[PDB]
Assembly symmetry: T
Homo-oligomer: 138 residues x 12
């Protein structure tokens, strides 16, 4: 039912870094409604704020779709907060992080996530939602 979509540093800049972050929210919220879900979309440049949203999902046992931006590669604290989630965690990157700098090919999140989607654009979010909708059966 409730799915949390959390975006990390710089993702507020989408469209100027053409879909904007507001349009992304709209797209996600339409998809989720079609799927029978309710998406809660949040973005912050602040690690502490991302931690607090992860903590809340942990306490509520709600899935998470996380695009942690550069913190993917660098934050053990984020990793550790994510390891507490009991529900599914799907890591998303809009670009293909394996076609860029070598340092972007290591993620602290992937090993603890249920799965990862990269390179498929903003549609990656939508596809993550669909996994979570079809992974509510038994």
């Amino acid at each position: 039912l409730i799915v949390n979509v959390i975006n990390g540093p710089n993702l507020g800049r989408l469209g100027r870094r053409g879909t904007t972050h507001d349009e992304l929210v709209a797209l996600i919220e339409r998809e989720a409604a079609e799927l029978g879900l309710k998406a809660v979309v949040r973005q912050s440049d602040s690690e502490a704020q991302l931690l607090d949203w992860i903590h809340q999902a942990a306490d509520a046992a709600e899935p998470v779709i996380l695009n942690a931006g550069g913190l993917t590669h660098t934050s053990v604290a984020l990793r550790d907060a994510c390891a507490e989630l009991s529900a599914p965690l799907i890591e998303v990157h809009i670009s293909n992080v394996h076609a860029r700098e070598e340092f972007r090919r290591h993620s602290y999140l992937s090993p603890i996530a249920t799965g990862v989607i990269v390179g498929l654009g903003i549609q990656g979010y939508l596809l993550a939602l669909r996994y979570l909708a079809e992974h509510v059966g038994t």
Copy 2:
């Protein structure tokens, strides 16, 4: 319209390594029909045979969804055949290859692929199909 789904070594063993490879074919072909696509699903344990199917997709300019199994980590020849594709190439792994041995966290295919889906089970294939259906607009 036509999408090629190619499975590499050991993927014929699905279900005993519970969905079998035949059931996977059936699932993919139903999804593709719903999406308005036609999926051609092939599996081989032979690198040379996988190369030939990639070559054919290159000549036809048809997208590919590739689960290369262990060859993901080891074959430069497969990589090189894939670099010739002009249409989208989506790399899929059923399990989360970042939660296993360290050697599975390097892929020769990811850098040249449009994107990658891992850890989402057999549904990863279906989600790759949906990207390709929504990425036929302009």
Copy 3:
């Protein structure tokens, strides 16, 4: 006399990640009183806030007992703030950080700390207090 105990990201979650962070505060404050000390215990998920508490200890020349959580492994800025302390700095980890992932076996703090205690549970804090009480003689 005054000792600062500072806890970093995720340590507010103790007990659910059975002793809670409030119980830890209580335990530390009882020990410190028995030892003739006054413990000031603070926790934050925010690097900037941890920096400010370190800066204050530097200006006051008061010892610090620091459990920096994941920032131990990743923050040069925290390290650098800690290098300004003139009083003792004791690094504490509740779990044995050498029995986990390889990345947890490198600390930016250990080289600049007076000493380090790991693996001894919440009692590590209490033992750090006792060092500081017996290291006030000449």
Copy 4:
């Protein structure tokens, strides 16, 4: 005309870590006036706040002189915000970061910066200003 000088974690402590951060501001603002520029000097220990000031410079197409302190070595998110700048970005370190610990000899910022000045003291800032003044001709 407008140049942004942004200082990262611990730089507020200058003089006690003998020129203070206020004196640095004064020195920069006098130099800039002599050069015909207007310097806006900001300092924060908070990554999110540094990101926001970088974002603003990106939107305004104004140059930046950045001393990111320890975040130089560790933040991909800062790097990524900086990659959006269209105007010049000059990385400054007061000390010679190549004469210290080995870990300080890798910067995530240098590859994306116009240039870098290290080891020349607070005068590094002033010299960065002069580059920007003479790099306004055609």
Copy 5:
């Protein structure tokens, strides 16, 4: 009740390498009595002799406080003997082994030990005793 304190190569030289090894024994034995324990303190420069004392602790299921000196960094055989202990094993270093040569920052013992204390001087031994006294409850 019985705790074994075992010191490895060069620790017989304490005080001239100002507390001597005899004074250390005395200090440990007074602390242990205060705690209600009985400490058995042994030192040898001989790996085979250290192995035999570890084997005996294994057979008796008695805790160990071990300062293995240079063998910490180099002996797989010592590690392997220690892995047989069922009771707690606390690794102690008098100096901060992370503030010295890089090679001293890897220990074969830490991963298999209950916990580790470094940098706190001879008081590290005493603090290890206190852990073991308070870790005899249920």
Copy 6:
């Protein structure tokens, strides 16, 4: 008063590798006069000749501004000659050596230099002169 500017291999080719090496000399000598200095500018493709000019600066206790070209990355002998200088040594690169090949991001000179300027064009030389002029006070 006297400052030595020494250029290493290939720097004689400036402008064709648009400012030529003669124009650089002229620019440096005008700046230096404005600053009250006297610049002596030399260029050679010969390591032995660069060594001899460094030796002379060492004997005279005169500062050096050095652009060692490729020898920056490869010559321990140059490094060692430079370590004898008692006056300031400022390393200069016209391009940003951190935005190119990985091998150019290690310099044998930086650790022993007072500071380093890279990426600021030929103006880097001029800025190095200004440091040296303002670093003649007490």
Copy 7:
């Protein structure tokens, strides 16, 4: 009862690369009969064919003695097929693979095998058979 002996690339060349591959088959089949076993010996230069023989042993729950030749060092796909075996897998090399090139000292098979024999010549096969005969008791 049935044991599979599978030889990989180049092993058909034994004797000319003095025992030939046919003589090896004969030697193995005589030993196995003496032991009360039935050995099925197969050799191929084709990875896909080796995979198929491993798959068959997996389905039948029969032990395997495998000399994978160069594929030992390079094939993740072979490894993965072997991980499905429930019966014992004994890796054999005729020469001592640790006395040659460094690259031959890493095997993808050893970690998943029951055990490994190297350097003992063709007798290694025979000794592997004897393990399997004495490892059929309870």
Copy 8:
């Protein structure tokens, strides 16, 4: 007299990956006739087939000119087959394999080959033929 030219995976695609593989055969066979040689040109995407052609050259003691494509970088089995050749082995790459990805700069074949030609286009084959013609004297 007889020289074998063997091409590995993907080389059948020459011209579309403008000279085609058939034209290459024609060019090689004309050159060889001019030189007094007889060239036998073979191409396969199958490692096992390449092995068999190498084995045949070994048994006949005929030289080989080998373009192993991606298998250059990855196959120990190919290497090992090649080590059996008594006649000259010349490794050829049409492109400069040192101007591409880092992984292409290591070859398992070069150390065992007589020599290597890269970057000289299809003419590399022809030049390899000429070496072999002039290396038939005493």
Copy 9:
């Protein structure tokens, strides 16, 4: 005729670390008699004692079967003593040392040994004896 079986540190603990070291001796001595050999079995936790037994085998030109325990991974001195043996040296490990910690996958002994057996239990010793019995012909 005479074969030396030497066991290193911790191997005296077999059965409690269910076959004991005495039972191993008995098993080896029965096998050897069946084979027409005489086995001399020795175990020590002391490197110097192992060295002396290796030296004696060197002087007598008698084969050795060596299980050096942790010293396999760490002792150059043991290696060097073993390099003097003229008769066969067979390295044995009871467990599969490639299925454990990464550090156990490097042996100083393997490169100088005739061959190695790992993972086959105590039967590895017996199989080593059989090699030595069948390797006494011409």
Copy 10:
């Protein structure tokens, strides 16, 4: 028409390090005449002199065949001079530099060269000439 053949350190010693450097010059000059070219052959042990000959080829836009001897592996300055050539640059080694020490398998020149010939003896020079003659058509 004009091709420059430049030989680096130690190549003057050919024949005693049986063809001498004078005979090499003669062989090259005969080949070049047969091909319709004019070869200018130079050798020096001095990096600065090699640089000057490269600079001259750059200014004249003439091809170069370069055997830089040990400087291949070590000189960034030589590399950088070579990067200025607009005409073809063919790297030659007489021996197979991949069959020797590991350090000889990295070249600073190969990535910037048109192609490389190694292991083919002095005939490598002659083959490089032939490439350049047939690469003068359109």
Copy 11:
């Protein structure tokens, strides 16, 4: 006056591993007498015994000439004992340890020794004695 010459594991085997260890003692003792010194020569295969002889030299402030055999490369404990010497410590190897295996090119002793002699045979000892005789002046 008194110089200690200490030999480590395997050095008792000199001559059979043609000068024997007794002849070495004789040679050293004749040289030392000629120089006006008194040499005390000791050899052991036991680390603990070598430690005790180093400890004694430390307490007496007598120089040491040490050939630690394989322990050079592996013992931190030996290193640490040696760091206590106040008089000169000269490391000797009879063979050139840089012309052998790569692992022999790292010594734990060299960094703490006054100097090192390798490759000069048994005469290395004699030359070490001569240094110590001429290094007794002021």
Copy 12:
């Protein structure tokens, strides 16, 4: 009889970098006369000049004592010239090159030299002479 002592870059600066290079020559020439030798001492900052002196020693089959200064660590060309010497080559460093920067602990010369002396001051030269005098017997 004739021994060549060759000094590389910066060694002309001895005494100011208290024995000067002229005094070193005098000391060497007195020692050599006492030993019955004739020493020829040369120093240059020029690699090409050092090469020429090595070449001459090669042609004459005369020993060499070489202090190559920084070129020890960096020149493959020097190494290669030295490999041609048939007479002994003794590498000398005045300081202990293993007690300084890590990069000084790798020498291109040591593996090809007869032996090496470091850390023994200018007396190292004299001791090298004595080896060569006593290594003229049979």
